Design a protein around this ligand. Structure first.
Ligand SMILES: C[C@@]1(c2cc(NC(=O)c3ccc(C#N)cn3)ccc2F)C=C(CF)OC(N)=N1
Length: 381
């Protein structure tokens, strides 16, 4: 397709619960196939390049006639573990994506810790965010930037994350209208580094948290397909769970559950969804003093934990958790919505996902417009 319909790319995402969403890619000539995690929270294209025992397969540079060494390394630490690699370029394509082949930067991973997941079916990570947060620096052109520069692929992508096997769609260079219902609503990308946005108001079951909105974006709010949780700043988390506790006080659960220190189980088929509140985030709109509201269900924040071998019941993780890095709108948010990363226009569109899991009483929602004053004061500097 060219606009509005891209049958080729529908259902091009796979994964497992809690292990993220991956797309099939090829690197080098002749083409080497790899499953690659779709990550809007980073900016490196990095692939396994050595026989780590967890890996189904890895990039074999020796086999590629189109491979070029940049004679430079890159060391990428995170909070939990790291990866390290050798920088180069090669020909990269997406079999179930646009019908093109691009020369892109590839970090050939040669050492890692707590990076590859044991039992997962991906071998690398596609950083979809901007050069500003690329490693080692902003001169290493991210994949999507190389894609847009070298081809006629429009400067946007969209994500439908569907939620042991998960599915979804990454529509590269377009939007597929079958993937959502109702209207897209757009929030401005504040700065092109992460996919930074501003949260303007928070409601639990319709009840405003009544916090200084500056808190909601302390020090950052981002959209991140490479994180499971809805992550909230601790002050906001405290307030949020306090209200979530109140709305659900029809039942009691240990404190640890709310901190994700323990899991909570119900007997098969009898999860009290209705005891749990909806969560609504108001996002800055396109227009001065105008906002919109996205609403998620317990279906989104209470996640099935499948691999619990010491229990026979239906066990769940509370997937809202505190943070030091700001708000992270991960899979918990994105699984409710069709999300349009409108890079050309510096904006992010949300619409009700045609695939989000709901019940017969409550649906995920995108609603507007609303009148919100002082939305700029919600940003942090
Ligand atoms: C570069 C990475 C990253 C992300 C992941 N992501 C996942 O493993 C993962 C798991 C489940 C879901 C879901 N749903 C999404 N991503 C793995 C390794 C990894 F290094 C680092 C962080 C933390 F700082 O956050 C983001 N967005 N990306």
């Amino acid at each position: 397709g060219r606009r509005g319909s891209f049958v080729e790319m529908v259902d091009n995402l796979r994964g497992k619960s809690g292990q993220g969403y991956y797309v099939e890619m090829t690197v080098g000539s002749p083409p080497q196939t790899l499953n690659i995690l779709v990550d809007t929270g980073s900016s490196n294209f990095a692939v396994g390049a050595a026989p780590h025992p967890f890996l189904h397969r890895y990039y074999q540079r020796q086999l590629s006639s189109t491979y070029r060494d940049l004679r430079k390394g890159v060391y990428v630490p995170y909070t939990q573990g790291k990866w390290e690699g050798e920088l180069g370029t090669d020909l990269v394509s997406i079999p179930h994506g646009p019908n093109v082949t691009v020369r892109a930067n590839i970090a050939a991973i040669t050492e890692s810790d707590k990076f590859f997941i044991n039992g997962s079916n991906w071998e690398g990570i596609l950083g979809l965010a901007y050069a500003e947060i690329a490693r080692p620096d902003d001169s290493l052109e991210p994949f999507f930037d190389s894609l847009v520069k070298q081809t006629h692929v429009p400067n946007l992508f969209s994500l439908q994350l569907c939620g042991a096997s998960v599915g979804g769609s990454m529509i590269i260079g377009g939007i597929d209208h079958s993937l959502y219902t109702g209207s897209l609503w757009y929030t401005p990308i504040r700065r092109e580094w992460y996919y930074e946005v501003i949260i303007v108001r928070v409601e639990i079951n319709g009840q405003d948290l009544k916090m200084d909105c500056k808190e909601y974006n302390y020090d950052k709010s981002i959209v991140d397909s490479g994180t499971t949780n809805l992550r909230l700043p601790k002050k906001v988390f405290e307030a949020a769970v306090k209200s979530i506790k109140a709305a659900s006080s029809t039942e009691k659960f240990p404190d640890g559950f709310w901190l994700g220190e323990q899991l909570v189980c119900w007997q098969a088929g009898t999860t009290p969804w209705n005891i749990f509140p909806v969560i609504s985030l108001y996002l800055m709109g396109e227009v001065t003093n105008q906002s919109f509201r996205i609403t998620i269900l317990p279906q989104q924040y209470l996640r099935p934990v499948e691999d619990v071998a010491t229990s026979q019941d239906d066990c769940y993780k509370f997937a809202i958790s505190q943070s030091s890095t700001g708000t992270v709108m991960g899979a918990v948010i994105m699984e409710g919505f069709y999300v349009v990363f409108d890079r050309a226009r510096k904006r992010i569109g949300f619409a009700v996902s045609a695939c989000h899991v709901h019940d017969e009483f409550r649906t995920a929602a995108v609603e507007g417009p609303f009148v919100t004053l002082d939305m700029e004061d919600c940003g942090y500097n």
